Amino acid sequence: YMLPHLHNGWQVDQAILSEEDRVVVIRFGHDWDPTCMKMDEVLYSIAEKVKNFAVIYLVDITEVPDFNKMYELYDPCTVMFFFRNKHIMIDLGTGNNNKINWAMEDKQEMVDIIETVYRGARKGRGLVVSPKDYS
Amino acid sequence: DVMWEYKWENTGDAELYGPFTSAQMQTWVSEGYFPDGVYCRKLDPPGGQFYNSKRIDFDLYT
């Protein structure tokens, strides 16, 4: 019951474009990467829980480098959020509102973040605050 | 439909306060009753995890 993967820019475009009522969660990185391994285990374990309002996709940014420049994907692991084709920003308290770029292994915490993104974006917020301050 | 509980300190001993609507929490926020925030969580599901209300936008759950 693995997480779905997207294998080119075109597929990523279609996936971001295809959800009217769910957050599109994208993990940019590589399966082989340790940070990605920890983040993937979280995403895998919450995928069923959030499936009504979020879909999660994994993208290998070697196989799919299309967005590297666009979203400055220079970290080992990057989770980003999209709603109705729009990049949703989250104030995590880190100074960077564009992405989660560390493996947070708190399962419920990740669920709560996704739910906040969904609830915010549905009400037209392009920026939302994370429930916990990450320093 | 969402419901909240909160405590003044983030400790295992602090009193928790009955079920509240999101609108109720929002009114209390805007009226200055949580000037340093309170430690709140949704009542469903039971898991919990308490957050400082200062980071919670109660208007998102209305």
Rounded to 5°, angle at Cα A70 from A40 and A68: 50
Using CB atoms, which residue from A120, A132, A133 is nearest to B60?
A120
Rg of chain B taking only CA atoms, in angstroms: 11
- State how many domains chain B has: 1
List the domain range (segments joined by +) for residue B59.
1-62
User: Looking at the complex, does the CB of residue B56 fall below 8 Å from at least one CB of chain A?
Assistant: yes
Give SS3 for B18. Answer: strand
Residue in B closest to A124 by C-alpha: B60
At A55, list the tokens.
């879909």
Is A132–B55 a contact, with Cβ atoms under 8 angstroms apart?
yes
Distances (CA, A) of A112 to A54, A91, B4, B25, B45: 12, 14, 14, 18, 11
Q: In whole angstroms, what is the distance from residue B40 CA to residue B6 CA?
A: 4
- Overall resolution, Å: 2.3
Which residues is A55 bridged to in the sheet?
Answer: A24
CB distance B57 to A128 below 8 Å: yes
In 3D space, the residue among A25, A33, A13, A81 whose CA is nearest the CA of residue A58 turns out to be A25
User: Residue B40 gets which letter from DSSP?
Assistant: E
Q: Calculate how close chain B gets to A119, using CA atoms only, in Å.
A: 6
Q: What are the residue boundaries of the structural domains of chain A, listed by start?
A: 1-135
Q: Calculate how close chain B gets to A93, using CA atoms only, in Å.
A: 10
Chain A residues inside the 8 Å CB shell of B51: 112, 131-132
Residue in B closest to A121 by C-alpha: B60
- The CATH architecture that domain A1-135 belongs to is 3-Layer(aba) Sandwich (3.40)
User: Looking at the complex, does the CB of residue B57 fall below 8 Å from at least one CB of chain A?
Assistant: yes
At B16, list the tokens.
């928790």
Name the maximum alpha-carbon separation found in chain B. 30
User: What is the C-alpha end-to-end distance of chain B, expressed in Å?
Assistant: 8
**Domain holding B2: CATH number?**
3.30.1490.40
Q: In whole angstroms, what is the distance from residue B50 CA to residue B48 CA?
A: 6
At B9, list the tokens.
């300190």
Is A129–B52 a contact, with Cβ atoms under 8 angstroms apart?
no
Q: In whole angstroms, what is the distance from residue A20 CA to residue A109 CA?
A: 24
Q: In whole angstroms, what is the distance from residue B44 CA to residue A115 CA?
A: 13
Using CB atoms, which residue from A120, A128, A131 is nearest to B51?
A131
Determine the residue among B1, B57, B62 to mutate to test chain A binding: the one whose Cβ has the most chain A Cβ atoms within 10 Å: B57
CB distance B7 to B38 below 8 Å: yes
Q: How many residues does chain B have?
A: 62
Q: In whole angstroms, what is the distance from residue A128 CA to residue A131 CA?
A: 10
- The sign of the CA dihedral B42, B44, B50, B51 is negative
Is A119–B56 a contact, with Cβ atoms under 8 angstroms apart?
no
User: Looking at the complex, does the CB of residue B51 fall below 8 Å from at least one CB of chain A?
Assistant: yes
Where are the alpha helices (H) located in B1-62, listed in sequence order? 22-30
In 3D space, the residue among A108, A23, A48 whose CA is nearest the CA of residue B51 turns out to be A108
CA B48 to chain centre: 11
